[PDB]
Design a protein around this ligand. Structure first.
Ligand SMILES: [Mg+2]
Ligand SMILES: [Mg+2]
Ligand SMILES: [Mg+2]
Ligand SMILES: [Mg+2]
Ligand SMILES: [Mg+2]
Ligand SMILES: [Mg+2]
Ligand SMILES: [Mg+2]
Ligand SMILES: [Mg+2]
Ligand SMILES: [Mg+2]
Ligand SMILES: [Mg+2]
Ligand SMILES: [Mg+2]
Ligand SMILES: [Mg+2]
Ligand SMILES: [Mg+2]
Ligand SMILES: [Mg+2]
Ligand SMILES: [Mg+2]
Ligand SMILES: [Mg+2]
Ligand SMILES: [Mg+2]
Ligand SMILES: [Mg+2]
Ligand SMILES: [Mg+2]
Ligand SMILES: [Mg+2]
Ligand SMILES: [Mg+2]
Ligand SMILES: [Mg+2]
Ligand SMILES: [Mg+2]
Ligand SMILES: [Mg+2]
Ligand SMILES: [Mg+2]
Ligand SMILES: [Mg+2]
Ligand SMILES: [Mg+2]
Ligand SMILES: [Mg+2]
Ligand SMILES: [Mg+2]
Ligand SMILES: [Mg+2]
Ligand SMILES: [Mg+2]
Ligand SMILES: [Mg+2]
Ligand SMILES: [Mg+2]
Ligand SMILES: [Mg+2]
Ligand SMILES: [Mg+2]
Ligand SMILES: [Mg+2]
Ligand SMILES: [Mg+2]
Ligand SMILES: [Mg+2]
Ligand SMILES: [Mg+2]
Ligand SMILES: [Mg+2]
Ligand SMILES: [Mg+2]
Ligand SMILES: [Mg+2]
Ligand SMILES: [Mg+2]
Ligand SMILES: [Mg+2]
Lengths: 158, 262, 134
RNA sequence: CGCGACCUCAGAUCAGACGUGGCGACCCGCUGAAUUUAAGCAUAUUAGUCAGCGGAGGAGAAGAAACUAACCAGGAUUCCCUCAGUAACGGCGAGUGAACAGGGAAGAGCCCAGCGCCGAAUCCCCGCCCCGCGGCGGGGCGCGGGACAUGUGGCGUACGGAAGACCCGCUCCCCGGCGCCGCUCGUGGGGGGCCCAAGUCCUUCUGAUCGAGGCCCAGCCCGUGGACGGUGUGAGGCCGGUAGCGGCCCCCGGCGCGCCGGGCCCGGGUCUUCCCGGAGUCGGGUUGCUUGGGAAUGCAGCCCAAAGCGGGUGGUAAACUCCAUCUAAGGCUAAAUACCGGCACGAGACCGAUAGUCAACAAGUACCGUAAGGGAAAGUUGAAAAGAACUUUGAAGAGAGAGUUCAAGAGGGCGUGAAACCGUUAAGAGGUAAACGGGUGGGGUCCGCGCAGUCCGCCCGGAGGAUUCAACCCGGCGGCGGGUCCGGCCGUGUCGGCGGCCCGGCGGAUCUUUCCCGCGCGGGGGACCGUCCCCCGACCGGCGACCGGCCGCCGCCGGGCGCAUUUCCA
RNA sequence: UACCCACCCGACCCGUCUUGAAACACGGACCAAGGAGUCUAACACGUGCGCGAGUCGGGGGCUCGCACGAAAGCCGCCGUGGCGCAAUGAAGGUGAAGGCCGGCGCGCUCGCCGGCCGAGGUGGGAUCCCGAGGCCUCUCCAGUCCGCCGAGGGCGCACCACCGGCCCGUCUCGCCCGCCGCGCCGGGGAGGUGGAGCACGAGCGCACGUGUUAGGACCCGAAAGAUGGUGAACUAUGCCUGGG
RNA sequence: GCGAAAGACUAAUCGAACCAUCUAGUAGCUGGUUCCCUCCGAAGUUUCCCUCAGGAUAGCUGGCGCUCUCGCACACGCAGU
RNA sequence: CCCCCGGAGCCCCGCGGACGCUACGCCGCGACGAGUAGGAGGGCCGCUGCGGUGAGCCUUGAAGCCUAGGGCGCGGGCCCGGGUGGAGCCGCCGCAGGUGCAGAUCUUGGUGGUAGUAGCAAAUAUUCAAACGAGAACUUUGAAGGCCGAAGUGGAGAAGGG
RNA sequence: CGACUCUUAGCGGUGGAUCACUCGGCUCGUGCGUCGAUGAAGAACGCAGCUAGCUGCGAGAAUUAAUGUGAAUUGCAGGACACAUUGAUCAUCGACACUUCGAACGCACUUGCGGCCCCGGGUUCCUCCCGGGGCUACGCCUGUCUGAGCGUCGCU
């Protein structure tokens, strides 16, 4: 029974909110459950970027959002034959492969290629064995670091 | 519980039977059979509006509100008036924003700590705590909240280099990091002005923590101290400046008992 | 303060873990201190009381210096039963009266294979803590 | 009128496996209302909810697009925020009512069938040995079985792959054992056991202390321990404990080297030849449920039923027509994600025994109903049974003494022990039922007193009696106030130093890539403005911000002053 | 003041529904204990506090075995967004700006070009400023200081009333066009009207009061409806088998 | 369901059982709604209602307020006149 | 000349100010204070919980309970006198409620009046003596009177009962 | 003062409020995520020196062996033992056990009926009979044996 100026209100509580209410007194213990994963995963994979693999620069879709940029899913395929990285190798080298992106422009292609070219250069390939041959980066470039990258690898700033 | 007194299967034999029209319990050769169930009014039964879990237990403050709550608590951690007037037994203390060497972060034994609190003449707050230990009045006693006591001096330190261990067993003392101050603990009870012991390391870090005034915090993102609503807080000086007194009508204080008419 | 969660601190829960603890544990609980002589000689503060151990009452109605020997141990009533520690009933039939370990002091331990090794191992732990603190 | 292959199909208490019930919060299929709501009412909603039913696991489902989009594009799932209570639906009304983009948790990808390539390269079950045996497995050897040619292995699967040619560079994984070395985060992984400070010090309360003063710094000790519980009252110290990369002993977990037995000739990049999608499926017509999906979102039955530059999609039917984007008909999967059931814990602004769960206890117990089912009441002696020995009255129940108890006016349904209610003792009343309001009076129990309540406090005058002073200086100490802002230190406003400016930073899409580093961009440096510091100089608020001297005054202490003073007393 | 008693005056038993209850209306023997406006979401106004054309809050992150801790702190997060920062139209979309001056186009109250000022005015408008004139002041005059009074005049917020203006919709009317393009192209005027508009801002966040709903919903209070189950031990029938 | 037929009977139950759940079912309708004091203080009137036991809006009430005046020798306004 | 209050000696004192000035304190004027529903305000009115704080109180006796023990508020209640009780409790400043009962044929438990009231009425039936026993109308034995009256109150079974 | 009655008081009960405790709830978190035909969940009955109930257990029945632990156990008895000893007790549990129903399994549920294997006595397989041990429920998979079919053939 309305009285003198309000809104209409179709509050939707005619069903049964009561039974299916989730309260959130997990929230903070969950915060911590999470903490211990972030934590543990890093200590397990010791030298490896804690955040996760390298992930591509990418443009947001719909018209409003245009001007932004993101970590995309993974770098395209077309992208790799160009950087000279085999798609199945990339996946082992902490390089994120989406294989499902239609690459339409040379602008965002080379932009995103430069990230791989950049990655190669500042990547210490820790060798199969200790007494190991080619492509693994030398015992100097090896001693210097035990360094997990905290935060997103080569973070994408607009 | 959601089932509180609500597990009964009682119809209510309403009207024509004297009784009362409550829902009354079925069959039986017990006594609990034709009692009443699901009435607030009745045994077994249940309350008004079962106290539910999704009560809005917790609450809310704006960052700025609760930053300059700390300001006001800290500013009154000077001013022996307010600090004493919490019964913080500061009389033989040398000075009030009480700063101490940064040797203190490194005591690792309660005996050292205790010898500091003598030599800063600050026993007698802990002493006081130490006399105020009794059994809580009420029902809390039978719930993990039996004893109680005063608060003792707050002690603050930019880095636990062993200190918090030392000042722990001493009753009343709470440690607070400077980088992580807390209004609950600086201003307990929502009253202002607790006795605090800055250690030089910490005491420097206060302006860089959360600002001087004509300078950013440089440790919080954007935060600067609250401005005052007025500068000359004493008005008694104001009220007998010659500026004011000159421009005032002369009093009226004959008073004026009313006149009985004859 | 306690800390270790994985321990209780609950008015009720360790009130409970009292008059429901098994005889296994009640030994440790039913311990009394040693007299200065032994506490010196042996480097052990307090011992579990045992059936034939000699004991001085310290608190209670009938405190004294009389070294009586322990007779038996209600670990059920969870209380010990000593020698001239006793009262006369209405009929003359003397009955002993209960006392804790905690309100009593050991003046002569009754030694053994199994009890010696505890006295060694407690005294070894004491000194390991003092050598660790050193 | 035989024997033999196969195909179909039986029988075996055959050899070996396995399935079935329960649990059921969470999980998945389906099924499925009506109260209720709409002020009725059937449309709608409750609501794909409850019951019903079916099904799983430590989580369940889903999942590697027949997606999203309309961007300059993104890129499996789920989840949280967000969209957003929005697009639409609706006797367009009650309600209903999602999605697309972004941010974030987490984040992993992959496998079939076919086309083909490869002496089935395969697979199953026996027998003998070699190792292995408390999740039955490797190694070998056997014209020991059998499936499989209606098709078993490898590569391969669309993000290309196969096959060829020559372009480049070069060779370590897997598994059965069998050892051994580093016990491998709460701050030595899991579990168990076992273990690690300090007073029963004085005195004094008390039945008993754990209480109150004290005790070489709030007393003594300890204090990486002062949580808690026990302990004839409130106990850091008595005891268990607590804290404490505190100790040690088993076991269990997991990860590191060796030996061995087996398995494996597994790359990378270029040019050509060809080779490709899963049918009664898509789609359509229809009907039925569903959502929000719509002139059809989803799911159904039936009817009709495809193609191969095709098919779906690209959200008001449709033709034409242009563009985008996936690729179904086969399939798997951690992670976040859910958890009123279980085991095991931790806590609380909680309830505190007519509350709190039905249940603090013989609680799902007693009892009821034939049965489905229904389903209670009921905690407390004391500290210790020390629970009345013994005399006596009484058939006995009960008493009186006595005894025990700090307390039995704590006596076995015992802390306390209300009111209704009843028990008797004392006082007073009593023909209009009691009971009530206003006003007095009498009497009591008590309560103040007074064996004068003459209540106190100044000042003064008088008369007695008694100490050292007050007034004064002088020595000291400590305040206060004043100013000369005298001298210095302090800060407000102004000016000067352009002096910090690079030895002062940080902010700014300010400017230079004349610079440097890394790849036009990023980082760094250099210029600019706004900001915040030094030097010194000048003015002014000269400010509670002092500190030094000079002053003026006060107070205290110590000297002097012996008595017409200055106190005390009556 | 309270207990009993005494008197004098007063005097119906409460609760409730009720035009009207002592009711010849209903509840109510007495006493103990229990017992009824609760929580959440959403609005709305009122108010409190923070910051302010912003402001937030999460959800996320970074910082704990929590003793206190499931706290507090902090984050180009800090804004990916909400709310606000602008409306109007069904929709394509448009979008708050006027004055003045000079010059140029015939100032044609039409078009364009240079400068100046910038939210138009009127009436009320707390009101701040100016203020003629008093009004003293031991003498006559002179005169600076100082207040009180002060007719009269000026700026005028907030607000109210009005008159003006600009954006969008729609109408009417009527002018000139630009010309990446051709105008069934786009574009510009005048007047009127519709708009929950702009016309030099007030929101945001967080409290609390009230209220209104949605919620079981202040508690108690039906006849019903639905879904699943148990019963022929009574009785009703049928049947089977016994007895009189 | 069962009825030689009477709405008989279905275990003290029948115009159609009992048990549990949906279940706080709904109720314009009965009843009640728990501490003091101070101040102001109604209506049973309006139009629409599947409205006549109820709602909708007219009123009247309180609260919250605000804009001002001037009783500070120096007031305009309002009004059951 | 017409001089300085650290002194005019003060009803005016402007050189410095109540005892009074909890600056939401206190003081003087006037004026006014019928109330259901409702609002609003005020409640050192009341209940239970926590953060503060009260060198709070407490085995030299708390809560409750009880009091023809003194009082105070208008009153919510509050404060004081004694006894008993035996373990804990309160005051202020805040915060938090499942928050204050006479009512609901309200819920549970208890208790009255009624009231020592209704009532112990279906089958004709008992009496004596002894025993036993503390105690006998009620048990037993004897004796006597009676009934059921073989379609039984006789003697055996089913189902049920256990 | 006669008795009753009312009020109040002084005490006696009755009742069980109030208060004060609390081995229980409730709520909220965390860790793990535990069945079975080898025979579960659920029930029946039995088991102690004196034991009805709860609880614990299963004809090895208020437990079994073992390892810690390390002297009790106890309402009362009674006990071994040698407390210089698996050594009392308790916890753990890992060694062994598992009465009857039950998905309940030979068929039915009376508690009766059987079948088929073994080993005692009986026999001296002579068959019962008496004694003892193992199997025997339905579905279905891989395999095996035995088959059926005017199904399709082949050879005769
Ligand atoms: Mg991440
Ligand atoms: Mg309840
Ligand atoms: Mg209380
Ligand atoms: Mg199953
Ligand atoms: Mg209705
Ligand atoms: Mg309806
Ligand atoms: Mg209806
Ligand atoms: Mg419907
Ligand atoms: Mg539906
Ligand atoms: Mg719906
Ligand atoms: Mg269901
Ligand atoms: Mg998606
Ligand atoms: Mg203690
Ligand atoms: Mg204690
Ligand atoms: Mg100890
Ligand atoms: Mg389909
Ligand atoms: Mg629907
Ligand atoms: Mg698929
Ligand atoms: Mg799957
Ligand atoms: Mg799965
Ligand atoms: Mg009870
Ligand atoms: Mg209960
Ligand atoms: Mg009791
Ligand atoms: Mg009681
Ligand atoms: Mg007593
Ligand atoms: Mg007592
Ligand atoms: Mg007690
Ligand atoms: Mg009693
Ligand atoms: Mg009486
Ligand atoms: Mg009398
Ligand atoms: Mg009515
Ligand atoms: Mg009448
Ligand atoms: Mg009535
Ligand atoms: Mg919105
Ligand atoms: Mg109906
Ligand atoms: Mg009829
Ligand atoms: Mg009034
Ligand atoms: Mg509460
Ligand atoms: Mg009550
Ligand atoms: Mg006859
Ligand atoms: Mg017979
Ligand atoms: Mg009771
Ligand atoms: Mg009680
Ligand atoms: Mg044949």
């Amino acid at each position: 029974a309305p009285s003198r100026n309000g809104m209409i209100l179709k509050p939707h509580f005619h069903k049964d909110w009561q039974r299916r209410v989730a309260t959130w007194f997990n929230q903070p213990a969950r915060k911590i459950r999470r903490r211990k994963a972030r934590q543990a995963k890093a200590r397990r994979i010791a030298p490896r970027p804690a955040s996760g693999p390298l992930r591509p620069v990418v443009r947001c879709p719909t018209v409003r959002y245009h001007t932004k940029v993101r970590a995309g899913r993974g770098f395209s395929l077309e992208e790799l034959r160009v950087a000279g990285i085999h798609k199945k190798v990339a996946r082992t080298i902490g390089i994120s492969v989406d294989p499902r992106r239609r690459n339409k422009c040379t602008e965002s292609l080379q932009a995103n290629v430069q990230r791989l070219k950049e990655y190669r250069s500042k990547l210490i390939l820790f060798p199969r064995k200790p007494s190991a041959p080619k492509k693994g980066d030398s015992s100097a470039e090896e001693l210097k670091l035990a360094t997990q990258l905290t935060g997103p690898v080569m973070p994408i700033r607009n | 519980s959601e089932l509180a007194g609500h597990q009964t299967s009682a119809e209510s034999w309403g009207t024509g039977r004297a009784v009362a029209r409550i829902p009354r319990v079925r069959g039986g050769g017990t006594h609990r059979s034709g009692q009443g169930a699901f009435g607030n009014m009745c045994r077994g039964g249940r309350m008004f509006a079962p106290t539910k879990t999704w009560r809005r237990w917790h609450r809310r403050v704006n960052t700025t509100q609760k930053r300059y709550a700390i300001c006001s608590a800290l500013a009154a951690s000077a001013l022996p008036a307010l600090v004493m007037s919490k019964g913080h037994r500061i009389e033989e203390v040398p000075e009030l924003p009480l700063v101490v060497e940064d040797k203190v972060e490194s005591y690792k034994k309660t005996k050292e700590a205790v010898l500091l609190l003598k030599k800063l003449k600050a026993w007698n707050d802990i002493k006081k705590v130490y006399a105020s230990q009794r059994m809580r009045a009420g029902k809390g006693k039978m719930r993990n909240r039996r004893r109680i006591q005063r608060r003792g001096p707050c002690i603050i330190y930019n880095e636990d280099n062993g200190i918090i261990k030392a000042f722990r067993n001493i009753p009343g003392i709470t440690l607070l990091n400077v980088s992580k101050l807390n209004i609950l603990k600086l201003a307990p009870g929502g009253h202002v002005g607790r006795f605090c012991i800055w250690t030089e390391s910490a005491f420097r870090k206060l302006d860089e923590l959360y600002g001087t005034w004509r300078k950013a915090a440089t440790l919080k993102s954007n935060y600067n101290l609250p401005m005052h609503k007025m500068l000359n807080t004493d008005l008694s000086r104001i009220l007998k400046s010659p500026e004011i007194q000159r421009a005032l009508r002369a009093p009226r204080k004959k008073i004026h008992r009313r006149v009985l008419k004859k | 303060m306690k800390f270790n969660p994985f321990v209780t601190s609950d008015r009720s829960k360790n009130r409970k873990r009292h008059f429901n603890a098994p005889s296994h544990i009640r030994r440790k609980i039913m311990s009394s201190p040693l007299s200065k002589e032994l506490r010196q000689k042996y480097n052990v503060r307090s011992m579990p009381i045992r059936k034939d151990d000699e004991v001085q009452v310290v608190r209670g109605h009938y405190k004294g210096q009389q070294i009586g020997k322990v007779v038996q141990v209600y670990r059920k009533k969870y209380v010990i039963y000593i020698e001239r520690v006793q009262r006369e009933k209405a009929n003359g039939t003397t009955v002993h009266v209960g006392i804790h370990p905690s309100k009593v002091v050991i003046t002569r331990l009754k030694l053994d294979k199994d009890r010696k090794k505890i006295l060694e191992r407690k005294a070894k732990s004491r000194q390991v803590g003092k050598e660790k603190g050193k």
